[PDB]
């Protein structure tokens, strides 16, 4: 028993992290087959980032201006191209540790594991959620750019995130592995509005189901509600509106626990309106929204990879 | 910036997890050099666990009764011995993926990463603290026994924990890699008192320093205190007494932030006496005690492995 915020095992991704250097700038790259993927602003100086013309700056670069190091293995760059906000460096050797993988663009509310890296060396792993406003609240120090987020299904690594920037508000923004930013952000050092964030309602409900499975039941009440009535409360507390699709995804959890989704919604409504009265749920004094329904099912059944 | 509960990269440990089967019981083992380490109750049936005589039960076993599988690699068991509560199975092949490693018995209050495994296959990784009462609050389903906790320093893996049992209260107990239990627990299915747990005071203080570094400052007051006066409050709220050794460990954090440790203690005293008034610190509505001072320094400087 027990419930923890759990990241995927990072071994398959550790074997793909490389160090990319262009001039005075170093960051992390992702080495899959014979291509290295990294944020395009590796070609920028500190002054460039204020208003970079990436096409013009990349013209000044040749294959030999990119230094790629995999621990101590030198990679010979034989081609380079810019795809949106990522640089694709063709190297003359395929990574022998390349896992089975896909590139995925995830939806807001979904979760992934981040392997934080510095100078091409992994430092730690943690689980994140893509916020409804397409930011993440991570832990990214200077030099962490190029760190990737991923999910693992059996033997397949689905890469969904590459880190690019820290907004002046302290939250983090990045792209998919095709170089398209999540949200409205651009890779330049300017003030950038993230927009109102909301709480991921279906994730909070899944976590409440996890609480019941593990023995925390005090928040269960004798009330029920309707989808429309609940959504009036959700809007007041800046929660995502619940749809029937969300109700459907929560189906397995409701079957196991015998608690209908609308009954759990009425529990959540009372928590929103009355707080927790200084009590805790799964060791938290706040409503946690970084566990998807799939995350809860994984940890309550024990699936491996 | 940003602060996250971060586990070590698990790659070096993933390559050491094997599946150990004896009769109808399967759990996880740790394959280092030509020795596999696993919990000794792999030799027990469900009925045995009520009152097992491990010496007698092990007599019934021979080398060929132990089946060790590393993914698909068959390991040939050529010797077996019981060291305290662990079984040491000598195999005829040394693990080619054995990292540099040590066995360490950690102190209460220290943290480590857990690689949760099932049937010898890793499923997830998360950070834990060894509670003052020598339990851990993990996520261990049926079949997770043999999962290990570890720390990584540069290229060296320090193994400190092997999971053995879930207490009737839902918390978890295990041994070091020499098979000596942390705390008073034994590997039999009985009621076992864990004893009063306390909050790890030096870890809470280190986390408050992490909060100040990241911009959460609202809890800083214009008060100070003394070590004796603070410890009177700590005792009232079931916190570990703070010693000068703890003050010394917090030295680097106090130097960076310019906040003397006793000033931060006075902040903590006010939080204990008055609560948080519905505010948060680093996204938490509770005082977090699972970050050591070393953990905070690592994540505020960006050390790699
Ligand atoms: Na960068
Ligand atoms: Na067991």
Swiss-Prot record, chains A, B:
All residue ranges annotated as the Peptidase C30 domain in the record: 1-305
Topological region Cytoplasmic: 1-305
Crosslink feature (Glycyl lysine isopeptide (Lys-Gly) (interchain with G-Cter in ubiquitin)) location: 5, 90
Active-site residue numbers: 41 (for 3cl-pro activity), 145 (nucleophile)
Catalysed reactions listed for this entry: TSAVLQ-|-SGFRK-NH2 and SGVTFQ-|-GKFKK the two peptides corresponding to the two self-cleavage sites of the SARS 3C-like proteinase are the two most reactive peptide substrates. The enzyme exhibits a strong preference for substrates containing Gln at P1 position and Leu at P2 position
Outcome of swapping residue 142 to A: Does not affect ability to cleave and inactivate human TRMT1
Means of activity regulation: Inhibited by pyridone-containing alpha-ketoamides compounds 13a and 13b. In turn, alpha-ketoamide 13b (tert-butyl (1-((S)-1-(((S)-4-(benzylamino)-3,4-dioxo-1-((S)-2-oxopyrrolidin-3-yl)butan-2-yl)amino)-3-cyclopropyl-1-oxopropan-2-yl)-2-oxo-1,2-dihydropyridin-3-yl)carbamate) inhibits SARS-CoV-2 replication in human lung cells. Inhibited ex vivo by michael acceptor inhibitor N3. Inhibited ex vivo by compound 11a and 11b.
Compartment(s) where it occurs, according to its Swiss-Prot or TrEMBL record: Host cytoplasm; Host Golgi apparatus; Host nucleus
Oligomeric and partner information: 3CL-PRO exists as monomer and homodimer. Only the homodimer shows catalytic activity. Interacts with host FBXO22; this interaction promotes the proteasomal degradation of nsp5.
Role of this protein: Cleaves the C-terminus of replicase polyprotein at 11 sites. Recognizes substrates containing the core sequence [ILMVF]-Q-|-[SGACN]. Cleaves and inactivates human TRMT1, preventing tRNA guanine(26)-dimethylation of tRNAs. May cleave human NLRP1 in lung epithelial cells, thereby activating the NLRP1 inflammasome pathway. May cleave human GSDMD, triggering alternative GSDME-mediated epithelial cell death upon activation of the NLRP1 inflammasome, which may enhance the release interleukins 1B, 6, 16 and 18. Also able to bind an ADP-ribose-1''-phosphate (ADRP).
This protein's name: 3C-like proteinase nsp5
């Amino acid at each position: 028993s027990g419930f923890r915020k759990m990241a995927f095992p990072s071994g398959k991704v550790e074997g793909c992290m490389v160090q990319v250097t262009c001039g005075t700038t170093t960051l992390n790259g992702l080495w899959l087959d014979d291509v290295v993927y990294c944020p395009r602003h590796v070609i920028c100086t500190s002054e460039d980032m204020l208003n970079p013309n990436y096409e013009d700056l990349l013209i000044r670069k040749s294959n030999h201006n990119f230094l790629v190091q995999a621990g101590n293995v030198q990679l010979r760059v034989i081609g380079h191209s810019m795809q949106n906000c990522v640089l694709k460096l063709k190297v003359d050797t395929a990574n022998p540790k390349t896992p089975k993988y896909k590139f995925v663009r995830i939806q807001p509310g979904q979760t992934f594991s981040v392997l934080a890296c510095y100078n091409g060396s992994p430092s730690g792993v943690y689980q994140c959620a893509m916020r409804p406003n397409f930011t993440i609240k991570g832990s990214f120090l200077n030099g962490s750019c190029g760190s990737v987020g991923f999910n693992i299904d059996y033997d397949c690594v689905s890469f969904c995130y590459m880190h690019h920037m820290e907004l002046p508000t302290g939250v983090h923004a990045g792209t998919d592995l095709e170089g398209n930013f999540y949200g409205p952000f651009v890779d330049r050092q300017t003030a950038q509005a993230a927009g109102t964030d909301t709480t991921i309602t279906v994730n909070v409900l899944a976590w409440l189901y996890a609480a019941v499975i593990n023995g925390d039941r005090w928040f269960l009440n004798r009330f029920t509600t309707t989808l429309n009535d609940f959504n009036l409360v959700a809007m007041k507390y800046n929660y995502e509106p619940l749809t029937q699709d969300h109700v459907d995804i929560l189906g397995p959890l409701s079957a196991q626990t015998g608690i209908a989704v609308l009954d759990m919604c009425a529990s959540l409504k009372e928590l929103l309106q009355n707080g927790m009265n200084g009590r805790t749920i799964l060791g938290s004094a706040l409503l946690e929204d970084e566990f998807t329904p799939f995350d809860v099912v994984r940890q309550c059944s024990g699936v491996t990879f």
